[PDB]
Amino acid sequence: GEAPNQALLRILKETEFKKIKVLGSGAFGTVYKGLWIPEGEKVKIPVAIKELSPKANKEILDEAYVMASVDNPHVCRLLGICLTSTVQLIMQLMPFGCLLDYVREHKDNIGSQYLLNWCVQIAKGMNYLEDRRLVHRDLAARNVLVKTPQHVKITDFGRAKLVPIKWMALESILHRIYTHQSDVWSYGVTVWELMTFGSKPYDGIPASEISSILEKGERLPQPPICTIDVYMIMVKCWMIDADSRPKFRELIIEFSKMARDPQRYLVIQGDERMHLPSPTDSNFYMDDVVDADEYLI
Numbered sequence: 001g002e003a004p005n006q007a008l009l010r011i012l013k014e015t016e017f018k019k020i021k022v023l024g025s026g027a028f029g030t031v032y033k034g035l036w037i038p039e040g041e042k043v044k045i046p047v048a049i050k051e052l053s054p055k056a057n058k059e060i061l062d063e064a065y066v067m068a069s070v071d072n073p074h075v076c077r078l079l080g081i082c083l084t085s086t087v088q089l090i091m092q093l094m095p096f097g098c099l100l101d102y103v104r105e106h107k108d109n110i111g112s113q114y115l116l117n118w119c120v121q122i123a124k125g126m127n128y129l130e131d132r133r134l135v136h137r138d139l140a141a142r143n144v145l146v147k148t149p150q151h152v153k154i155t156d157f158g159r160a161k162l163v164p165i166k167w168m169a170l171e172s173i174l175h176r177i178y179t180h181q182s183d184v185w186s187y188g189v190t191v192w193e194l195m196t197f198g199s200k201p202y203d204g205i206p207a208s209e210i211s212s213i214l215e216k217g218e219r220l221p222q223p224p225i226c227t228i229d230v231y232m233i234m235v236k237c238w239m240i241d242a243d244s245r246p247k248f249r250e251l252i253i254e255f256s257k258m259a260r261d262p263q264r265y266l267v268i269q270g271d272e273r274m275h276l277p278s279p280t281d282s283n284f285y286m287d288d289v290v291d292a293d294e295y296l297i
Protein backbone atom coordinates (compact mmCIF):
# COMPACT_ATOMS: atom_id res chain seq x y z
CA GLY A 1 0.00 0.00 0.00
CA GLU A 2 2.06 2.88 -1.53
CA ALA A 3 5.78 2.40 -2.32
CA PRO A 4 8.60 3.34 0.10
CA ASN A 5 10.26 6.63 -0.89
CA GLN A 6 13.94 5.66 -0.89
CA ALA A 7 15.20 9.10 -2.06
CA LEU A 8 18.45 10.26 -0.38
CA LEU A 9 18.45 13.58 1.49
CA ARG A 10 22.00 14.93 1.18
CA ILE A 11 23.17 17.12 4.07
CA LEU A 12 25.81 19.60 2.85
CA LYS A 13 28.38 21.42 4.92
CA GLU A 14 28.17 25.28 4.72
CA THR A 15 32.01 25.37 4.03
CA GLU A 16 31.45 23.35 0.81
CA PHE A 17 29.61 26.19 -0.96
CA LYS A 18 29.96 29.93 -1.57
CA LYS A 19 27.35 32.66 -2.31
CA ILE A 20 28.23 34.91 -5.29
CA LYS A 21 25.22 37.28 -5.58
CA VAL A 22 21.44 37.56 -4.96
CA LEU A 23 19.18 36.17 -7.78
CA GLY A 24 15.84 36.94 -6.10
CA SER A 25 14.14 37.93 -2.84
CA GLY A 26 10.68 37.61 -1.29
CA ALA A 27 8.86 36.97 2.03
CA PHE A 28 10.34 33.39 2.09
CA GLY A 29 13.90 34.80 2.15
CA THR A 30 16.57 35.13 -0.54
CA VAL A 31 17.94 32.99 -3.43
CA TYR A 32 21.67 33.25 -4.12
CA LYS A 33 23.75 32.29 -7.14
CA GLY A 34 26.62 30.12 -5.84
CA LEU A 35 29.20 27.38 -6.33
CA TRP A 36 29.22 23.98 -4.65
CA ILE A 37 32.75 22.51 -4.30
CA PRO A 38 32.26 18.96 -2.79
CA GLU A 39 34.83 17.12 -0.53
CA GLY A 40 38.07 16.53 -2.51
CA GLU A 41 36.14 15.91 -5.77
CA LYS A 42 37.82 18.52 -8.12
CA VAL A 43 34.36 19.81 -9.31
CA LYS A 44 32.59 23.18 -9.11
CA ILE A 45 28.81 22.89 -9.47
CA PRO A 46 26.84 26.17 -10.20
CA VAL A 47 23.93 26.32 -7.71
CA ALA A 48 20.91 28.40 -6.57
CA ILE A 49 20.79 28.56 -2.74
CA LYS A 50 17.41 29.24 -1.16
CA GLU A 51 17.97 30.69 2.29
CA LEU A 52 15.09 31.03 4.81
CA SER A 53 9.92 30.79 12.88
CA PRO A 54 8.85 27.08 13.30
CA LYS A 55 6.12 27.07 10.54
CA ALA A 56 8.46 28.54 7.83
CA ASN A 57 11.00 25.75 8.70
CA LYS A 58 8.27 23.06 8.37
CA GLU A 59 7.15 24.45 4.96
CA ILE A 60 10.76 24.60 3.63
CA LEU A 61 11.32 21.00 4.87
CA ASP A 62 8.03 19.91 3.15
CA GLU A 63 9.20 21.43 -0.18
CA ALA A 64 12.68 19.85 0.42
CA TYR A 65 10.98 16.41 0.87
CA VAL A 66 9.12 16.66 -2.52
CA MET A 67 12.09 18.30 -4.33
CA ALA A 68 14.49 15.51 -3.14
CA SER A 69 11.97 12.88 -4.37
CA VAL A 70 11.98 13.85 -8.07
CA ASP A 71 14.38 12.77 -10.79
CA ASN A 72 13.55 13.77 -14.37
CA PRO A 73 15.28 15.87 -17.12
CA HIS A 74 12.26 18.24 -17.13
CA VAL A 75 11.86 18.72 -13.36
CA CYS A 76 14.20 20.51 -10.83
CA ARG A 77 15.55 18.21 -8.10
CA LEU A 78 17.04 19.16 -4.68
CA LEU A 79 20.85 18.74 -4.67
CA GLY A 80 20.91 18.96 -0.85
CA ILE A 81 20.17 20.96 2.30
CA CYS A 82 22.42 22.89 4.67
CA LEU A 83 21.50 22.95 8.35
CA THR A 84 22.80 26.30 9.59
CA SER A 85 21.06 28.84 11.93
CA THR A 86 18.84 29.30 8.79
CA VAL A 87 17.92 26.21 6.67
CA GLN A 88 19.22 26.41 3.05
CA LEU A 89 18.00 24.46 -0.03
CA ILE A 90 20.76 23.73 -2.60
CA MET A 91 19.33 23.54 -6.12
CA GLN A 92 20.68 23.61 -9.69
CA LEU A 93 21.52 27.07 -11.12
CA MET A 94 19.12 27.69 -14.04
CA PRO A 95 21.19 30.52 -15.59
CA PHE A 96 18.48 32.03 -17.86
CA GLY A 97 16.01 32.52 -14.94
CA CYS A 98 12.25 31.83 -15.18
CA LEU A 99 10.52 31.18 -18.54
CA LEU A 100 8.04 34.02 -17.90
CA ASP A 101 10.82 36.73 -17.79
CA TYR A 102 12.65 34.96 -20.63
CA VAL A 103 9.64 35.18 -23.05
CA ARG A 104 9.13 38.86 -22.06
CA GLU A 105 12.85 39.82 -22.55
CA HIS A 106 13.68 37.67 -25.62
CA LYS A 107 10.31 38.00 -27.47
CA ASP A 108 12.01 39.38 -30.67
CA ASN A 109 14.19 36.20 -30.99
CA ILE A 110 11.69 33.51 -29.92
CA GLY A 111 10.52 31.41 -32.86
CA SER A 112 7.76 28.76 -33.12
CA GLN A 113 10.27 25.87 -32.72
CA TYR A 114 11.31 27.05 -29.23
CA LEU A 115 7.72 27.70 -28.12
CA LEU A 116 6.40 24.27 -29.21
CA ASN A 117 9.49 22.48 -27.81
CA TRP A 118 8.98 24.27 -24.41
CA CYS A 119 5.33 22.98 -24.47
CA VAL A 120 6.57 19.36 -25.06
CA GLN A 121 9.16 19.66 -22.22
CA ILE A 122 6.64 21.07 -19.72
CA ALA A 123 4.15 18.29 -20.66
CA LYS A 124 6.98 15.69 -20.23
CA GLY A 125 7.87 17.10 -16.82
CA MET A 126 4.20 17.17 -15.79
CA ASN A 127 3.59 13.59 -17.07
CA TYR A 128 6.56 12.49 -14.87
CA LEU A 129 5.01 14.23 -11.79
CA GLU A 130 1.76 12.38 -12.62
CA ASP A 131 3.62 8.99 -12.81
CA ARG A 132 5.05 9.91 -9.37
CA ARG A 133 1.43 10.59 -8.11
CA LEU A 134 2.43 14.25 -7.52
CA VAL A 135 -0.05 17.12 -7.98
CA HIS A 136 1.99 20.35 -8.50
CA ARG A 137 -0.87 22.80 -7.64
CA ASP A 138 1.28 25.82 -8.76
CA LEU A 139 2.18 25.31 -12.42
CA ALA A 140 2.73 28.73 -14.16
CA ALA A 141 5.40 30.24 -16.51
CA ARG A 142 7.05 31.78 -13.37
CA ASN A 143 7.69 28.18 -12.08
CA VAL A 144 9.33 26.88 -15.26
CA LEU A 145 13.08 27.65 -15.25
CA VAL A 146 15.52 27.95 -18.12
CA LYS A 147 18.76 25.84 -17.92
CA THR A 148 19.50 26.76 -21.58
CA PRO A 149 17.00 28.32 -24.10
CA GLN A 150 16.53 24.80 -25.48
CA HIS A 151 16.03 23.09 -22.02
CA VAL A 152 13.37 24.04 -19.44
CA LYS A 153 12.34 22.43 -16.13
CA ILE A 154 9.34 22.67 -13.81
CA THR A 155 10.10 23.71 -10.21
CA ASP A 156 8.57 25.27 -7.03
CA PHE A 157 7.18 22.32 -5.08
CA GLY A 158 6.00 24.65 -2.23
CA ARG A 159 2.34 23.60 -2.88
CA ALA A 160 2.97 20.07 -4.30
CA LYS A 161 1.07 17.15 -2.73
CA LEU A 162 0.57 13.36 -3.18
CA VAL A 163 -3.41 30.88 -3.74
CA PRO A 164 -2.85 31.26 -7.62
CA ILE A 165 -6.50 31.92 -8.71
CA LYS A 166 -5.80 32.91 -12.40
CA TRP A 167 -3.99 29.52 -13.06
CA MET A 168 -6.49 27.35 -11.16
CA ALA A 169 -9.14 24.93 -12.42
CA LEU A 170 -12.74 25.90 -11.49
CA GLU A 171 -13.08 22.81 -9.11
CA SER A 172 -9.96 24.12 -7.25
CA ILE A 173 -11.26 27.73 -6.82
CA LEU A 174 -14.79 26.57 -5.79
CA HIS A 175 -14.16 23.28 -3.89
CA ARG A 176 -10.34 23.04 -3.31
CA ILE A 177 -10.26 19.85 -5.49
CA TYR A 178 -6.78 19.15 -6.93
CA THR A 179 -5.93 16.38 -9.38
CA HIS A 180 -3.49 15.83 -12.28
CA GLN A 181 -6.41 17.19 -14.41
CA SER A 182 -6.47 20.45 -12.38
CA ASP A 183 -2.67 20.70 -13.23
CA VAL A 184 -3.71 20.30 -16.95
CA TRP A 185 -5.83 23.51 -16.54
CA SER A 186 -2.71 25.34 -15.17
CA TYR A 187 -0.74 23.87 -18.06
CA GLY A 188 -3.19 25.53 -20.48
CA VAL A 189 -2.74 28.91 -18.68
CA THR A 190 1.11 28.39 -18.78
CA VAL A 191 0.94 27.72 -22.59
CA TRP A 192 -1.19 30.91 -22.99
CA GLU A 193 1.52 32.92 -21.11
CA LEU A 194 4.22 31.55 -23.49
CA MET A 195 2.17 32.21 -26.65
CA THR A 196 1.39 35.81 -25.60
CA PHE A 197 5.13 36.34 -24.71
CA GLY A 198 4.39 36.75 -20.99
CA SER A 199 1.02 38.52 -20.83
CA LYS A 200 -0.78 38.55 -17.49
CA PRO A 201 -3.91 36.28 -17.61
CA TYR A 202 -7.20 38.21 -17.11
CA ASP A 203 -5.23 41.50 -16.59
CA GLY A 204 -7.09 44.04 -14.43
CA ILE A 205 -9.78 41.51 -13.37
CA PRO A 206 -9.61 40.91 -9.55
CA ALA A 207 -9.21 37.24 -8.38
CA SER A 208 -12.73 37.29 -6.74
CA GLU A 209 -14.30 37.98 -10.18
CA ILE A 210 -12.42 34.99 -11.89
CA SER A 211 -14.74 32.13 -10.61
CA SER A 212 -17.87 34.04 -11.84
CA ILE A 213 -16.20 34.81 -15.25
CA LEU A 214 -15.23 31.08 -15.69
CA GLU A 215 -18.77 29.88 -14.67
CA LYS A 216 -20.34 31.98 -17.51
CA GLY A 217 -17.87 30.33 -19.92
CA GLU A 218 -15.33 33.15 -20.51
CA ARG A 219 -11.79 31.89 -21.26
CA LEU A 220 -8.40 33.47 -22.03
CA PRO A 221 -8.39 34.93 -25.61
CA GLN A 222 -6.75 33.35 -28.68
CA PRO A 223 -3.12 34.67 -28.82
CA PRO A 224 -2.36 36.40 -32.19
CA ILE A 225 0.42 33.84 -33.08
CA CYS A 226 -1.82 30.80 -32.37
CA THR A 227 -3.51 28.85 -35.09
CA ILE A 228 -6.90 27.30 -34.14
CA ASP A 229 -4.89 24.00 -33.75
CA VAL A 230 -2.89 25.40 -30.79
CA TYR A 231 -5.78 27.39 -29.24
CA MET A 232 -8.16 24.34 -29.41
CA ILE A 233 -5.57 22.48 -27.26
CA MET A 234 -5.53 25.36 -24.64
CA VAL A 235 -9.38 25.45 -24.67
CA LYS A 236 -9.60 21.64 -24.06
CA CYS A 237 -7.34 22.20 -20.94
CA TRP A 238 -10.08 24.61 -19.68
CA MET A 239 -13.17 22.28 -19.97
CA ILE A 240 -15.51 22.10 -16.89
CA ASP A 241 -15.35 18.24 -16.86
CA ALA A 242 -11.77 17.46 -15.60
CA ASP A 243 -11.82 14.03 -17.34
CA SER A 244 -12.68 15.76 -20.68
CA ARG A 245 -9.39 17.74 -20.51
CA PRO A 246 -6.38 16.20 -22.34
CA LYS A 247 -3.89 14.02 -20.41
CA PHE A 248 -0.24 15.17 -20.12
CA ARG A 249 0.80 12.11 -22.22
CA GLU A 250 -1.54 13.30 -25.06
CA LEU A 251 -0.22 16.92 -24.72
CA ILE A 252 3.31 15.50 -25.26
CA ILE A 253 2.12 13.75 -28.48
CA GLU A 254 0.10 16.73 -29.83
CA PHE A 255 2.81 19.36 -29.23
CA SER A 256 5.49 16.92 -30.62
CA LYS A 257 3.62 16.51 -33.93
CA MET A 258 3.39 20.36 -34.06
CA ALA A 259 7.12 20.80 -33.20
CA ARG A 260 7.89 18.76 -36.39
CA ASP A 261 6.37 21.54 -38.64
CA PRO A 262 6.27 24.57 -36.28
CA GLN A 263 5.42 27.32 -38.81
CA ARG A 264 2.15 25.49 -39.66
CA TYR A 265 1.03 25.89 -36.01
CA LEU A 266 2.39 29.27 -34.81
CA VAL A 267 2.56 32.36 -37.03
CA ILE A 268 5.52 34.62 -36.05
CA GLN A 269 7.06 37.46 -38.15
CA GLY A 270 10.71 36.72 -39.04
CA ASP A 271 10.55 33.15 -37.61
CA GLU A 272 13.57 30.85 -38.53
CA ARG A 273 15.80 33.98 -38.89
CA MET A 274 15.79 34.27 -35.04
CA HIS A 275 18.86 33.35 -32.91
CA LEU A 276 19.01 32.35 -29.19
CA PRO A 277 22.24 31.37 -27.23
CA SER A 278 23.29 27.67 -27.43
CA PRO A 279 26.21 25.60 -25.89
CA THR A 280 27.82 25.80 -29.43
CA ASP A 281 28.45 29.64 -29.07
CA SER A 282 31.57 31.62 -28.01
CA ASN A 283 31.54 32.58 -24.29
CA PHE A 284 28.17 30.74 -23.70
CA TYR A 285 29.46 29.16 -20.42
CA MET A 286 35.86 28.58 -14.77
CA ASP A 287 38.06 25.46 -14.42
CA ASP A 288 36.47 22.14 -13.23
CA VAL A 289 32.90 23.54 -13.61
CA VAL A 290 30.37 20.66 -14.03
CA ASP A 291 26.62 21.10 -14.39
CA ALA A 292 24.51 19.44 -11.62
CA ASP A 293 22.92 17.22 -14.32
CA GLU A 294 26.37 15.54 -14.90
CA TYR A 295 27.37 15.37 -11.22
CA LEU A 296 26.01 11.96 -10.16
CA ILE A 297 27.17 10.47 -6.81
Ligand SMILES: CO[C@@H]1CCN(c2nccc(Nc3cc4c(cn3)nc([C@@H](C)O)n4[C@@H](C)C(F)(F)F)n2)C[C@@H]1F
Pocket: 023, 024, 025, 028, 031, 048, 050, 076, 077, 091, 092, 093, 094, 095, 096, 097, 098, 145, 155, 156, 157
Ligand atom coordinates in the same frame (compact mmCIF):
# COMPACT_ATOMS: atom_id res chain seq x y z
C1 LIG B 1 10.38 30.47 -4.06
O1 LIG B 1 11.36 29.43 -4.09
C2 LIG B 1 11.60 28.89 -5.39
C3 LIG B 1 11.87 27.37 -5.24
C4 LIG B 1 12.25 26.75 -6.59
N1 LIG B 1 13.34 27.53 -7.23
C5 LIG B 1 14.32 26.89 -7.99
N2 LIG B 1 14.30 25.57 -8.21
C6 LIG B 1 15.28 24.96 -8.87
C7 LIG B 1 16.36 25.68 -9.37
C8 LIG B 1 16.36 27.07 -9.12
N3 LIG B 1 17.43 27.83 -9.56
C9 LIG B 1 17.43 29.14 -10.04
C10 LIG B 1 16.44 30.08 -9.73
C11 LIG B 1 16.57 31.37 -10.25
C12 LIG B 1 17.71 31.66 -11.05
C13 LIG B 1 18.66 30.68 -11.29
N4 LIG B 1 18.49 29.47 -10.78
N5 LIG B 1 17.60 32.95 -11.43
C14 LIG B 1 16.54 33.49 -10.92
C15 LIG B 1 16.14 34.93 -11.13
C16 LIG B 1 17.20 35.75 -11.87
O2 LIG B 1 14.96 34.93 -11.91
N6 LIG B 1 15.83 32.53 -10.22
C17 LIG B 1 14.55 32.75 -9.50
C18 LIG B 1 13.37 31.87 -9.93
C19 LIG B 1 14.77 32.91 -8.00
F1 LIG B 1 15.17 31.71 -7.43
F2 LIG B 1 15.76 33.86 -7.77
F3 LIG B 1 13.58 33.32 -7.40
N7 LIG B 1 15.36 27.61 -8.42
C20 LIG B 1 13.13 28.99 -7.40
C21 LIG B 1 12.81 29.61 -6.03
F4 LIG B 1 13.90 29.45 -5.17
